[PDB]
Symmetry: C2
Subunit: 265 residues, 2 copies
Amino acid sequence: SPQLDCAGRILRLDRARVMGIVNVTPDTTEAAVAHGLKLVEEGADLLDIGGESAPVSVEEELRRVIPVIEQLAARTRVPISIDTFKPEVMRAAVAAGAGMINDIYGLRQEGALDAAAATGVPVVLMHMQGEPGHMQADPHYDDVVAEVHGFLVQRLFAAEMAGFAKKNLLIDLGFGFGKTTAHNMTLLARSERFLELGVPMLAGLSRKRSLGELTGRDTPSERVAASVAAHLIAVQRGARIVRVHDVAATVDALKIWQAVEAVPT
Amino acid sequence: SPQLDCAGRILRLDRARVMGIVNVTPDTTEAAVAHGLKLVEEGADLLDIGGESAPVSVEEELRRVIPVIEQLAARTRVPISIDTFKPEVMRAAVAAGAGMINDIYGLRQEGALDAAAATGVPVVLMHMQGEPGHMQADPHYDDVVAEVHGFLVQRLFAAEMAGFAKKNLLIDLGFGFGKTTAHNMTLLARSERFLELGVPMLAGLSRKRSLGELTGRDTPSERVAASVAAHLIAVQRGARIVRVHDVAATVDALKIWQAVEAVPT
């Protein structure tokens, strides 16, 4: 069973780990720092800091996330991830204490590939159809599994060629990003097939629109039970990190699961 | 796909069904009926009416549950189950419109076997160590799976000898009833073993103390996420009815499960 060296903060991947979501959007720094610490006390094994909400300028993104990373790094021991697709924010976040990069664009932004390689921290390669801010309105796939797989194969290849070590790579199937409810459930059901790529898999389905379509819950905050069910299924099918808003609820569910899995067959 | 004929109210078991818990305890009648109606609109496929809390006298148990069954039967189309171990309560409830008997004692109360046979409604044979009103302080099992199996085999045969048709029998592993948290997790993990009995399996772990022990939650109403996880796992391992307090939450989880399972492997 592998583990991540998150710039010195080790995260074992023998069991599923919970990544809490800390969005810094309008002081706002103290509120976000408090929010992360409260997620840690609820059981979060790591925190994901993001400054996007009009897309956010690099200067504003840096002003939003750097103080929150600096402070959380000094006030918790869990790995602190930076949720950005921009190379300057990757370099600066890591310099302020981030030990992981979570990139919705899959290092496809100009300079992101080389910048993330040079930081030496683990990087999550997400799949999305489209570009940050412009997701496909009518997503389409001949074979959503094969295309998401093919994309990940080539980003992983680019990462290796750009100088990455394999221990520093994760994949994320990117539920919700340019995908219908059918695409999402199909990827989730066949998600175990992506384990053949040999890197840990991160899954994020927290309060996603597809969960609401299936259950009829139009309000995202009413989608807690479905998110717990979704992340449990993702974990059963090989996801070893789950990115969630509802940390305590996900933590509780994983405890039931771990106890069930410990029984010898 | 099998089904229960609950005194004329058909309950299909092609997918897991949600049984809502309606406890009638001290106008308490109008409150319980309203609560039953609310569980139905939240999605409950059937309701379980019980008058126990100190053991309750038969006169009081009937005074509590009969009006609630009569009225709920007249205002919903769902099966109404009576949660009792007592023969008189079984006969009166079924005559008042109950279409199922849910028995913690496994028809072991004096006269229960013959009384329930004569009603003609499906009956849940639960396993418990101990007696109604006196639960075991230190439950023990050499082999909890084999012993729960052996018990259920014998209750099914005794029911067979009393005249039951198989369509009128379900089993219930009785999580929490004369069981440590460890016993519960072993039974839950290996619960698929009991599908060989050839009858539908009902699972109830809603807000149970064992979930609090696994998660650290002292408040039972703080145990929803763990109840959702437990019941999803129970359904994945063969339970086709789940008995729950948090109906809307469990329904939302089961819809996610069904959507994932509909994808072709």
